[PDB]
Symmetry: D2
Subunit: 125 residues, 4 copies
């Protein structure tokens, strides 16, 4: 019932080898789990987000985003990442994203609190 | 039961005059609504996110993030913003954030798909 | 001879207490020195950049940017920051910027190579 | 005389088909020209920047950055982009960057003034 509800739901892999498992709801919800292949992270972490459930019909991608806070039963990196991007459907479907990773810091170090990057997710590898 | 569950839950206002109403769950969940004072937006939009429910005890802020997809019953801007930041408690409590706003685009225009900025939220104004 | 050649040339201070001394050329050049109040930095570092020497006449700001590589005779942080922003003239003139700070890394750590932030520069403090 | 003075000097091409011609100075200077394959741009634009002329010797990349203001004799987009990244040498040498593109805006629209992205440059294509 979302246009890309079906295209988005499932398992995605990025260039780092991380795994994003997501379910897209009819209404715009994203829920799932994230496992990072890098960094101070082990096992799965909860994720939540949103997507545009009625995208433009002119060949544009589907805007979406989601957040992981890097606390689970195993580790707590006192950090959260948000990914902002778009889903592009078709035989080589992709989710192209940029992300912001904020670490909790003291006020003195807050200038250095946020990393930025980019991840591309595919349905294989 | 989250350390800052109580400090985060409520109504926050940014420098633009936008309003963020959020509830923080014991486990790390953020749910609420967002109303932008600017842009191609009207009324409230759903938001979801995550926060670190066991932050460092050394005066560091609390990492968190959340997403709004800019579709509601009134408008659809075919866009999503994610905010990444930290909550800082005390008499002048703040949520200091950076954000990424992705518009759905064609592949040809994808280079120009993402705006970046920064918002600071307070409990007054 | 640049519209804001005169408004930009001089000494500017950001929210951190850093000092940016710049000369703007008629043709679009920015040259000067930068002294960071924070981080792995001591004394002055060379900076170079560019500005729009014929901005729009409708009350818009003046786009500009510049780079510092964090090597001088005292220290080498194996890093470079670029600021992208706009100059806004008038009784409270400002340069509002966002910045990207890249550290040289191994390929394995390149995902974590770039910090992002924002600085606002004024003619006082 | 810079460690990567020779590796950086020359002609580079990004994923968009843009062309970056640069000379690296012994002391850390970058000078050259940029031609964008996309956007409101025609022909070459001046660029200036900086690089770390004494990078770490442990296989880390070489931090660098540069700026283009999008005014030349043909067009003026009232914008500037800064790229922040690192040079990685070897048989497949690359410059991996993130960038910030600021448009001059009114104060009311300044929230929407800055695009963010990422470009990867190679010596072929």
């Amino acid at each position: 019932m979302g246009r890309d509800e079906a295209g988005i739901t499932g398992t995605w892999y990025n260039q780092l080898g991380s795994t994003f498992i997501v379910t897209a709801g009819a209404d715009g919800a994203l829920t799932g789990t994230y496992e990072s292949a890098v960094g101070n992270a082990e096992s799965r972490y909860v994720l939540t987000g949103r997507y545009d459930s009625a995208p433009a019909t002119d060949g544009s991608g589907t805007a979406l985003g989601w957040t992981v806070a890097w606390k689970n039963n195993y580790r707590n990196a006192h950090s959260a990442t948000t990914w902002s991007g778009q889903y592009v459907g078709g035989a080589e479907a992709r989710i192209n994203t940029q992300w912001l990773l904020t670490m909790g810091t003291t006020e003195a170090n807050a200038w250095a609190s946020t990393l930025v990057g980019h991840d591309t997710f595919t349905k294989v590898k």
